[PDB]
Design a protein around this ligand. Sequence first.
Ligand code: HEM
Length: 180
Amino acid sequence: MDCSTNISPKQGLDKAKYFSGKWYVTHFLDKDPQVTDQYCSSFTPRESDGTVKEALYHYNANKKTSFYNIGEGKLESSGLQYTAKYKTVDKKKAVLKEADEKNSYTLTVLEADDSSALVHICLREGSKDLGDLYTVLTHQKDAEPSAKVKSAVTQAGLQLSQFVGTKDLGCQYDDQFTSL
Ligand code: HEM
């Protein structure tokens, strides 16, 4: 699999709108999943002096378990785009597996407004692209994405209807973990 090539951050985006509150994924478009389980996800991104730190949560909707990470990266000169290396942690943020040099993800902000966002994520390990994901984000579980963000999907060359909507997955979140 190769990650999607025509991906760059939207210029003129206000980063105060992206690095704010917490995000819940309402819709995801996964190009070539290596597993068949469907996930829900929430995360809390913060930025300081061009360094991004984000608490990340995944819920396996099939098995009904969840895992936790902390991503850390630098902002590109391009705008709201960053490559993050990532710690694996328990629900209390104790560090399990250290962040290394060969596993990373690149996140690109395609749109962001007061309620909603669209982001693209390329997951890599070494020389291999492992995941290519577009996610629609909102600030509360099961809030409706904004008209501006639905527009950005169509502008990215995609069909929102082709995304998996997470409302139907029976998602469970851990809001204590994502606080901070
Ligand atoms: C609903 C949205 C999402 C889905 C469906 C999804 C799906 C997946 C899947 C299937 C895996 C493989 C897990 C495994 O079997 O080991 C994974 C891993 C991962 N995802 Fe997500 N993901 C979502 C959102 C995100 C977001 C928003 C981020 C980062 C901001 C992200 C970053 C990662 C990272 C860093 C890993 C690797 C963790 C590890 O290897 O321990 N994902 N994701």
